[model samples]
Structures are given as structure tokens and as C-alpha cells.
Target: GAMEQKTVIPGMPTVIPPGLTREQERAYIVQLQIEDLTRKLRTGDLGIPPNPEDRSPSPEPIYNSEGKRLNTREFRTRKKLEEERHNLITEMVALNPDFKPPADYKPPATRVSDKVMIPQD
Candidate 1:
């Protein structure tokens, strides 16, 4: 038996909101993914490259409380760091022996798409 992973998904974003930097945000998302993936992979709950048709990993940027795109140039320079965080998470989820996802894991955000998306003024 063997585990196989093709390409990463919902991958580390190279261009995050300006100042946030890919490194900072990658860690945040990867941390969440690490926990979730650990469960799915360990239990074979889901398949890798969840969507093979879409391999590029660029998440839609978040809107502010006022619903404006964040603009911080600082985020553009941390691509490698972001990749490191991503790789580390992938390793933790795929190869780490001590990690196991909770049997009753609730995803981080059930509300992500449950609400209406009001157009920014």
C-alpha cells in the first residue's frame, strides 16, 4: 500500500493582500488545512488534488469589514516562505506519524458560503 499526492490544492497564494505577505497568510491557512487534511488523509475521507482540473492555488482575497479589497504591497515578497509553510503542512499531513485528525472534526468555517455576498459599493 502507498500514499500518493500529485500537486497541492488551494495552494499557497503567491500574492496575498498587500502587506500581509504570502508567508504570514500561508501559515494561517496551512495551519487550518494541516488539521483538516490530517483527518481526511488519515481516514481516507477525501482524495488528493480535490479538483484535478484546477491545480493553481490562488484563493479569492477577503474583503474588509467595509467590503474593500486589502491592499498591502508587503505580501508580494514572501513567496518562498509561503511555499515552506505549504510544504511543511503537506509533509505533516502526508508523512507525519504522530498526527491524526479528530474523528468529529468540524471544518473551520461553515459560514463561509452560507451568507449572502453583498456587492462592494
Candidate 2:
């Protein structure tokens, strides 16, 4: 089947003649950016910081096999760590201000790429 044909810019014809769509290209770029950031954040040696508030939803106190009250310290620790991550994400988004969508983000020329191969008989 023939791919959609149209010129992207005023004069530049993205003539790749490939089946690739602009949406696919944009998605790939966005995915790459996210992957790079995630790799930077996820570390092996980083330890979880405990919540200073010592606050977390806990079930009614139940005794352990030795009849000891379930500890809430561990739960608070995890909560604090999660909060840190949440804050980090917000910070990253705030740092980049001019990273908005451009008005001219149109498809590349008549053909985005010439990489498309028509199954030849």
C-alpha cells in the first residue's frame, strides 16, 4: 500500500519514501529522553532514606511469632524514600522551561525517508 504523501515544509521535501510516520519518530525521541533520565536516576548503591515524620498507613497492631508488635519504622522509611523520588521528578520538570512543543513541528518533506522498501515481485 502507498504511504501518505505530503510536503512537510515550504520547500524541504522529506523524501525518504519510507513508511515511517512523524508520530513514530516523535514517540521514539520522547522514549529515548525518558530512558536516559531513568537510567541516571536508578542506582544500585543508593540507599533508601527513612521518613522523618515516621508516618505511614499501618494495619491494627498484630503480634509477631514471638508476640512482638509489628514495627512501623520500616514502613516510614520506605515512604520517605518514595517521597524523595517524587520530589526529584518534580524538580526535573521545573528545571526545563523552554522545552515546549514548537509550532512548526510538521512532517518532513514530501517523503520523510527513502528507507521504505516496496516488496518487489
Candidate 3:
């Protein structure tokens, strides 16, 4: 038999279980404030910092060998959380096609810069 999956929120107790009503599930999801979570994740508003000794609020951006910008650790972390959020919303919509997200909810914007700088030969 396939294992049952559970909905999870970071730093919080599991509120989404197998048998909740669609509206109840929607309510729980709305209360999550995923956008705020993304902002906090991006800005290091959460207690943990990448480097404890580095007091600089704005760290230097990293680039790859081709001069392409790289995503910060926090950015990657936020992306993963957003992906999970999308999956949860998708599952809910699968159950109820008419289900809609909160009016204030907007998809998170991409944080990675697309500009590439490579010296011409």
C-alpha cells in the first residue's frame, strides 16, 4: 500500500490532515501567509542568518563562471517552500476545480537576475 502523505508547515504543527472540508483547508492555507514567509526568507528576517559573524545586511551577490547570477541559499530555500505551497494549492484545486486563492494572494516574483556578463572573444 502507498504511504499516506501529510501537509506540513515549517515551525508549526500539522493542521492539514486527510479529512478536512475543502473550505476548512482553504482557510488554513490562507492563514499561512506564504508571501510573508517568502519575504522573511529573502530578507533574513527570521532569526537565523547565513553567517553569524557577518554583520552586513546586504551581502554581495554571487556569480557563476559564465557571469550568471547565482541564487542565494535563502533564495533557493524560498523557492522550495514556494514549490511546496504550489503543490498544496494544486492538490486543493484538484479536489475542487472552482476553488480560488485569497484575493490578496499574488505569486512570488523571481528573485534571480537574468543579466549575464561574459567577455566577448
Candidate 4:
């Protein structure tokens, strides 16, 4: 327990404060540790420092074991499709003067070169 106190905050003395009992001192230390950890979390300063691997959740699909993307497209193909969609949307608004897409409307999917597919698992 003494070693743990020392290791928890290196270079700091682990002696109980003058007016405090040993248990009180231990509780105070724990509270201090919690505050220190909370500060580290708020300011983004924990673990391996530069990039903490386990600090956040994964960006990929949760159930996707093989790491397949939910959608597939080459960069050039995606750009072309996006430009076409933008033009189409603009044309619709221009024609109707007040045309608005549905709140849930997503643009059309781009072409896929392969009939070969990856399993999402």
C-alpha cells in the first residue's frame, strides 16, 4: 500500500498530513487521485501520451469482424457521383423555386466495379 501510494504520484511524499489520521490521509489521497485523473481526462493527457490506443471506441462497424466498409467506391468515382448529385439537387431547386429534399434523403449510391462482395459478419 505504501509502494502503491508512491507509485500513484511519483516523486511525491506519501506521509499522512499532520492533523489527519492514516485512514483520513488515504481517503484524501484517493480524492486527490480522482481529481488528477479527471483533470487528465478533461485536458486529454492520459496513458501513452501522444495517441492513447484504448482511450476511445473504434470508428469501424461494431459487428464487422473483417473490417469491410458499409459502402464501396473509388475516390474518382465518388467525386463524379457527388458532383452529379449536387447538380441534380440544384436543378430541382431552380426548377421548383422552393424545392427541398426530405430530411432523411441521402444521395444515390455510386457505381461499384465489382460484383465480388465482402461479408459484413
Candidate 4: misplaced stretches above 4 Å? Answer: 1-15, 47-121
Assess the local accuracy of residue 64 in candidate 1 as a C-alpha lDDT between 0 and 100: 60
lDDT of 4 by residue, 11-118 (tens): 435556799755455455544543444344344332322236536764542333456544322332333333333444444444444555434335445455344534
Candidate 1 segments exceeding 4 Å error: 1-4, 7-19, 48-86, 90-121
CA lDDT, every model vs. true structure: 0.44, 0.37, 0.53, 0.41
TM agreement with the true structure for every prediction: 0.28, 0.24, 0.38, 0.32
Q: What lDDT score goes with residue 71 in model 1? A: 40
Clashing pairs in 1: 18-72, 18-73, 18-75, 19-72, 21-75
Instruction: Kindly indicate the candidate among 1 and 2 with the higher lDDT.
Output: 1
User: What lDDT does model 4 reach?
Assistant: 0.41
TM-score of 4: 0.32
- The residue ranges of model 2 lying beyond 4 angstroms of the native Cα positions read 1-71, 97-121
lDDT of 1 by residue, 39-118 (tens): 44444434333345447765665666666775432232222224333455544444444554345433234454535634
lDDT (C-alpha) at residue 14 in model 3: 39
Q: After superposition, how far is residue 98 of candidate 4 from its true place, in Å?
A: 62
- Which of 2 and 3 is ahead in lDDT? 3
